Structure formats: C-alpha cells, structure tokens
Amino acid sequence: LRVRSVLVTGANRGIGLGFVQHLLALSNPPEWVFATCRDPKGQRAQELQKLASKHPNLVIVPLEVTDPASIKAAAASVGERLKGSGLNLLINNAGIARANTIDNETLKDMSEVYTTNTIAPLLLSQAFLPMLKKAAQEGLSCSKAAIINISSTAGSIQDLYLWQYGQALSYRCSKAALNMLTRCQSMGYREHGIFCVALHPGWVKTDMGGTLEDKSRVTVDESVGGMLKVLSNLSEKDSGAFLNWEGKVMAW
Amino acid sequence: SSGLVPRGSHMGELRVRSVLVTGANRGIGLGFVQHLLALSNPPEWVFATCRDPKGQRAQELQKLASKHPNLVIVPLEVTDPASIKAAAASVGERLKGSGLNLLINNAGIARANTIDNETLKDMSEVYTTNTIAPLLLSQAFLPMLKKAAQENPGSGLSCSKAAIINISSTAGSIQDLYLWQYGQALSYRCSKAALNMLTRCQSMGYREHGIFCVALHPGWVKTDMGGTLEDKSRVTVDESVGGMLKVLSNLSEKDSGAFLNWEGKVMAW
Ligand SMILES: NC(=O)C1=CN([C@@H]2O[C@H](COP(=O)(O)OP(=O)(O)OC[C@H]3O[C@@H](n4cnc5c(N)ncnc54)[C@H](OP(=O)(O)O)[C@@H]3O)[C@@H](O)[C@H]2O)C=CC1
Numbered sequence: 001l002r003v004r005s006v007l008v009t010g011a012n013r014g015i016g017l018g019f020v021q022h023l024l025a026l027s028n029p030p031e032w033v034f035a036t037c038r039d040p041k042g043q044r045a046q047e048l049q050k051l052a053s054k055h056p057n058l059v060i061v062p063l064e065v066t067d068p069a070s071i072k073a074a075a076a077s078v079g080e081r082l083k084g085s086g087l088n089l090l091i092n093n094a095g096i097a098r099a100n101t102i103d104n105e106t107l108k109d110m111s112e113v114y115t116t117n118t119i120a121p122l123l124l125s126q127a128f129l130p131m132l133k134k135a136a137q138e139g140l141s142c143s144k145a146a147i148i149n150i151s152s153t154a155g156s157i158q159d160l161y162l163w164q165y166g167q168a169l170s171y172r173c174s175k176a177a178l179n180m181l182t183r184c185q186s187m188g189y190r191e192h193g194i195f196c197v198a199l200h201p202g203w204v205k206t207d208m209g210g211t212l213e214d215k216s217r218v219t220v221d222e223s224v225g226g227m228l229k230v231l232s233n234l235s236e237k238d239s240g241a242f243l244n245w246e247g248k249v250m251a252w
Numbered sequence: 253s254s255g256l257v258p259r260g261s262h263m264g265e266l267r268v269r270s271v272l273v274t275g276a277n278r279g280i281g282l283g284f285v286q287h288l289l290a291l292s293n294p295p296e297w298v299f300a301t302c303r304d305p306k307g308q309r310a311q312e313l314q315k316l317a318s319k320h321p322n323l324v325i326v327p328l329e330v331t332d333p334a335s336i337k338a339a340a341a342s343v344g345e346r347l348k349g350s351g352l353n354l355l356i357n358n359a360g361i362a363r364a365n366t367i368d369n370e371t372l373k374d375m376s377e378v379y380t381t382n383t384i385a386p387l388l389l390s391q392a393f394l395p396m397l398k399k400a401a402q403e404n405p406g407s408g409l410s411c412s413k414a415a416i417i418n419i420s421s422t423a424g425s426i427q428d429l430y431l432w433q434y435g436q437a438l439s440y441r442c443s444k445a446a447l448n449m450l451t452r453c454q455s456m457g458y459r460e461h462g463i464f465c466v467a468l469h470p471g472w473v474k475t476d477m478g479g480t481l482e483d484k485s486r487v488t489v490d491e492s493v494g495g496m497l498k499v500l501s502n503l504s505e506k507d508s509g510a511f512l513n514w515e516g517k518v519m520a521w
C-alpha cells in the first residue's frame with residue numbers, strides 16, 4: 001500500500017481521524033493527505049489541527065459534503081495543491097445515523113440521511129473524477145486510483161446487522177443504496193482505470209457506534225489498520241464488492 | 253419448460269376484502285386495478301390512487317369506475333405528506349372501521365441520466381418518490397393494516413390477511429444490476445435497493461402485528477417506464493400482473509421480507 005495522495009471526508013473524529021493518523025504513519029507515507037471537515041475552526045477540529053502542525057504532509061480542507069458549492073471549492077482547492085498531479089485515493093467516510101424507529105421515520109430524516117450517506121459520495125466522486133482519472137493514467141488497485149465508500153452491514157439487506165439494537169431505517173436504507181452506488185461506480189468508472197469498493201469497518205467504538213459493551217466491537221485502530229490492510233490486497237475482480245475490515249465478503 | 257415455479261404458476265386463493273394500489277391510472281398500477289376487479293371473489297373495495305383524477309391522465313380509470321361500484325378513486329401525490337395524510341383519512345372513512353388487507357406501493361419514477369450527469373435534485377427526487385413515499389404510505393395505512401390483521405387473528409401471515417407489497421426492480425439488485433447496458437439510472441437503482449431494504453425492515457418490525465411484507469420485481473414490462481424496445485424478455489402488463497397476483501396468492505409467513513419476481517422466483521438482493 002503506497003499512495004502518493006489520499007482524501008478522507010469526516011476526518012476530524014472517529015474512523016475518519018483514524019484513517020488520517022494511520023495514513024501519515026505508513027511505511028511510505030503519502031505526499032499529500034487531505035483531511036476534510038465541516039468546521040476547521042471548531043473544537044472538534046483541534047486534534048486534526050495539531051496533527052497538521054506536525055505534518056506538512058496533512059492539508060485540512062473545509063467541506064460540507066451535502067453542499068454542491070462546498071464540494072466544488074474543496075475540489076478546486078485540492079486540485080491547486082496537487083498542481084495537476086492525481087488523487088490516488090478518495091475515502092468517503094463522513095456519515096450520519098438517526099435513532100428513529102420505523103414508526104417515527106420522517107421525510108426529513110430519510111432525506112437528510114440519504115443525501116449525506118449516499119448522494120454526497122456520488123457528488124464527491126464526480127467532483128474528484130478528473131483527479132482520480134489523472135492518477136490512473138500516471139488493472140485496478142487502491143495504490144493506483146480508487147474510491148473507498150465506508151458502508152455498514154447495517155445496510156446489508158440479507159443480514160440486517162444489529163437490528164435488535166436499532167432500527168435506523170433512514171441509515172440502513174442509505175447504506176444499502178451506498179452499496180448499490182459502489183457497484184454502479186465500479187461499472188461506470190472501470191473504463192477510467194478506477195477501482196471502487198465498499199467497506200464495513202465493524203462496530204467501532206466511536207460516537208456513532210455508541211456506548212454499548214460487546215466483545216465483537218473493535219477500536220478505531222483495529223478497524224482502520226484492517227481496512228488499510230484490505231485495500232493493499234485488492235485487485236480488479238473485487239471492484240464493486242462489499243468487504244469488512246478483516247477482508248471478508250459481506251452479503252448485500 | 254424445463255423450469256417450473258409453482259409459487260408463480262399455481263392459482264392460489266387470494267381473498268382480499270380491501271386493497272389500495274398507488275399509481276393506478278396507467279402502466280402496472282392500472283393492471284393491478286383491472287386484475288383485482290376481475291378476481292373470482294372481488295374485493296369489496298379497490299382503492300385506486302391517482303393524480304389529477306378528473307384530468308386526461310385518469311380517463312381510463314374513471315371509465316372503469318363508472319362500471320365497478322367497488323372501485324374507489326383516491327387523489328394522491330405520493331411525495332406530499334399532507335396528500336398522504338388526506339388519502340389515508342379518506343380511505344379510513346370509506347372503510348367504516350374495517351381493515352385494509354392489501355397495500356400495493358406501485359407508484360414510481362425513473363430518470364435517464366448517466367453517472368456523470370446524475371444530480372442532487374434527481375437523486376433526491378427519485379428517492380423520495382420510490383423509497384420514502386412507500387415508507388410514509390405504510391406508516392399512514394398501518395392502523396388499517398393492523399385492523400385487518402386483528403380481524404384474522406393468529407400466527408399466520410398472508411396477502412389475504414394484511415400485507416404490504418412493494419413493487420421494486422432487479423435493476424435495484426446489487427448483485428444482478430439488471431439492464432445496466434440499457435441504462436445506468438443510478439438514482440432509480442439506488443432507490444430500488446433502498447426499497448428492498450425498507451421491505452426487509454418492514455417485514456421484521458411489522459411481523460408482531462400480523463402484517464406480511466414482500467418486494468416484487470414485475471419483470472421488464474411494456475409500459476411508458478419500461479419503454480418501446482422489442483425484446484423476448486418483455487412481458488405485457490397482463491402477464492406481469494397476472495403473474496404477481498398468483499405469486500401473492502401463494503405466499504405464507506415464511507416468505508415475509510423476500511424479494512420475488514412475477515414468476516415466483518427468488519431474486520438476489
Ligand atoms: N462506528 C461504527 O460502529 C460504524 C460506522 N460506520 C460508518 O463509518 C463512517 C464513519 O463513522 P464514525 O466515525 O463512527 O461516525 P462519527 O459520527 O463518529 O463521525 C461522523 C464524521 O462524519 C462527519 N460528517 C457528518 N455529516 C457531515 C457533513 N454533512 N459534511 C461533512 N462531514 C460530515 C462528522 O463531522 P462533524 O465532526 O463535523 O460532525 C464526523 O467527522 C460513517 O459512514 C459510518 O456510517 C459503519 C459501521 C459501523
């Protein structure tokens with residue numbers, strides 16, 4: 001696993017911050033790690049800010065993933081830093097979940113969860129397509145040109161992971177639709193030499209994973225150490241797949 | 253043959269006192285209405301929802317209605333919670349305390365954009381029509397579905413007792429990705445995979461209530477959505493809906509939350 005440039009959304013806390021830390025700590029670290037976040041001037045951005053003060057490597061980019069203009073500015077801004085060099089790796093990680101029961105689910109929540117979890121990875125892939133294409137041109141591997149969508153087995157229609165812990169229909173629907181988007185990107189972008197894959201990170205001890213004790217749970221470090229290992233072993237025939245942080249096949 | 257799938261070919265008993273079909277003025281939805289009316293034991297009420305009920309769109313439905321006193325035409329814009337609300341309240345009043353046995357979420361849209369020109373607006377609109385509206389309609393009809401379940405008490409589940417039918421698509425199958433070469437239509441595919449998800453969740457959360465749920469693929473149907481293309485694989489509305497109704501007539505509680513086609517075959521998610 002050797003990537004010269006990577007962009008991670010939702011990079012200030014939880015799994016996305018884990019990705020940043022691990023990526024900077026790779027045997028051969030990237031030339032550019034772009035870590036996006038909503039409020040680079042907020043307390044929740046500080047851990048990232050300090051990381052950037054120690055690593056000239058790390059570029060904090062402001063990004064509201066549901067706002068097409070914010071997405072546009074973030075893409076101009078990273079494109080100017082890459083000075084026409086490619087983007088090897090896009091990790092769509094930013095996401096939300098809302099704790100609504102099937103009976104309480106609303107149009108608002110169904111819609112907002114979908115636009116953050118599903119539409120935004122599409123928009124961001126479209127906006128960075130030019131840079132991913134460049135990188136492919138400089139089979140299909142994550143070291144070359146890849147889109148990584150962080151999904152969930154909560155969005156597995158077969159498995160319905162963790163049903164007895166939460167219904168979160170807006171979230172499950174959005175994650176199934178993200179597994180479909182991943183398949184579509186895989187087929188649509190294959191001709192550009194761009195790999196796509198969906199990953200389940202596990203039930204991670206983050207703000208989203210919640211407070212519950214369970215020994216199937218994993219730490220941020222175990223989850224992202226896993227996912228990065230998985231990426232480093234992926235080849236063409238896995239493009240469009242849905243794999244977990246241990247590299248296992250998850251049912252759709 | 254050489255395949256045989258009796259789940260789809262055998263004419264089981266479908267005994268539904270009341271049904272509501274969304275998107276009932278043309279295409280598959282109109283087929284559902286005509287076939288439901290033509291059942292050996294016809295429903296006491298067939299609610300057919302449409303838009304612009306006295307406009308050109310709804311002409312053939314209005315014709316049908318003049319000839320069938322059991323056909324009730326209901327105005328409904330599925331993307332508008334207020335219109336959903338008013339439709340449920342109206343149907344509830346016509347039912348006079350009786351349950352709704354069968355809710356068919358059929359209304360839907362597809363758009364022709366490719367991956368490069370997919371938009372926020374198109375993704376969001378197709379989702380609200382194809383995925384959120386079946387959810388909201390299910391919530392609004394839940395009291396009446398539950399009343400139908402209570403009318404036929406017990407462990408069993410069937411489409412004659414209390415059922416939600418979501419008309420989905422193997423274009424929404426992540427594994428099969430049907431008709432990819434014909435059209436990418438990401439907004440449509442993502443919404444149908446999410447509808448398969450919704451159906452699954454509904455089967456789980458509504459089972460305790462006695463309500464059956466299932467997603468059906470109607471085939472590639474000769475309608476305005478399916479298009480004009482001459483193809484051996486294509487079915488007519490009569491074939492697709494005659495098939496789907498045989499499928500429903502055969503389902504039991506072991507099948508709740510399945511994804512099936514009009515032939516009764518099990519479809520991959
Ligand atoms: N933790 C778990 O157990 C599991 C998580 N996942 C998936 O992992 C991914 C990361 O999850 P996790 O780290 O746990 O989640 P957290 O809630 O801990 O982190 C959410 C991250 O996403 C960002 N985000 C949310 N909405 C937006 C937005 N509109 N624009 C820009 N950023 C946004 C948040 O920013 P801010 O700090 O500004 O709020 C934050 O950086 C998510 O996609 C999640 O669905 C999947 C399975 C399990």
Ligand SMILES: NC(=O)C1=CN([C@@H]2O[C@H](COP(=O)(O)OP(=O)(O)OC[C@H]3O[C@@H](n4cnc5c(N)ncnc54)[C@H](OP(=O)(O)O)[C@@H]3O)[C@@H](O)[C@H]2O)C=CC1
Pocket residue numbers: 274275276277278279280281302303309328329330331357358359360361381419420421422469470471472473474475476477478
């Ligand atoms: N035909 C095919 O090959 C396939 C179809 N399907 C599914 O079958 C279902 C019916 O498809 P089909 O008959 O072919 O489609 P049509 O385009 O022929 O008919 C669409 C129907 O849905 C109604 N509708 C659309 N949007 C709304 C809305 N916002 N509010 C209320 N009604 C709305 C339309 O009403 P109006 O007349 O007012 O526009 C019309 O009654 C769809 O869910 C479709 O996805 C799945 C696989 C294949």
